[PDB]
Design a protein around this nucleic acid. Structure first.
Length: 112
RNA sequence: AUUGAAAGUUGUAGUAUGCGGUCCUUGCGGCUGAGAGCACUUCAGGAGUUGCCCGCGCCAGC
């Protein structure tokens, strides 16, 4: 099954996907350039935006939440329960399941 | 079909997690919209005008 969704969302008073850190004063929101008409040739304007990484991570969070309750919820990484998106970072060969069982990252079949 | 023929610089990644622009504060105290002032002074509801003129309580009644 393949599905595609596209639409518009109203959204006001949102500090989503800021730039600066917590300890730094004046946390700034992310900006991105877009190209529009303005009843003449093409012009680029800088507008607030939310990156696709943020959306993908929150989809991951929702999927983990809705897959935990299923009877096959044991088949999950321990990092997933922590909402940790770092899947098999640099410098490791084995991973830990949700129940504590170890899994070897040798073949894709067993991993999936 | 030619320095030629095939050739992903690629796959995973939340610049995040917490945080009262807050606590105290009389736009308050005193202050006559007050004192002097005739809506007064002179004015006939007045002069003239018949409740008039004619009229049997009447004739027959032992």
């Amino acid at each position: 099954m393949y599905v595609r969704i596209s639409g518009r969302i109203r959204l006001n008073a949102h500090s989503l996907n800021a730039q600066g850190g917590g300890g730094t004063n004046y946390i700034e929101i992310t900006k991105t350039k877009v190209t529009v008409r303005t009843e003449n040739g093409w012009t680029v304007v800088e507008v607030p935006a939310i990156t696709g990484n943020m959306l993908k991570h929150w989809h991951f969070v929702g999927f983990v939440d809705y897959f935990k309750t299923t009877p096959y919820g044991v088949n999950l990484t321990e990092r997933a329960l922590r909402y940790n998106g770092t899947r098999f970072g640099q410098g490791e060969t084995t991973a830990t399941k949700a129940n504590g069982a170890t899994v070897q990252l040798n073949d894709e079949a067993t991993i999936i």
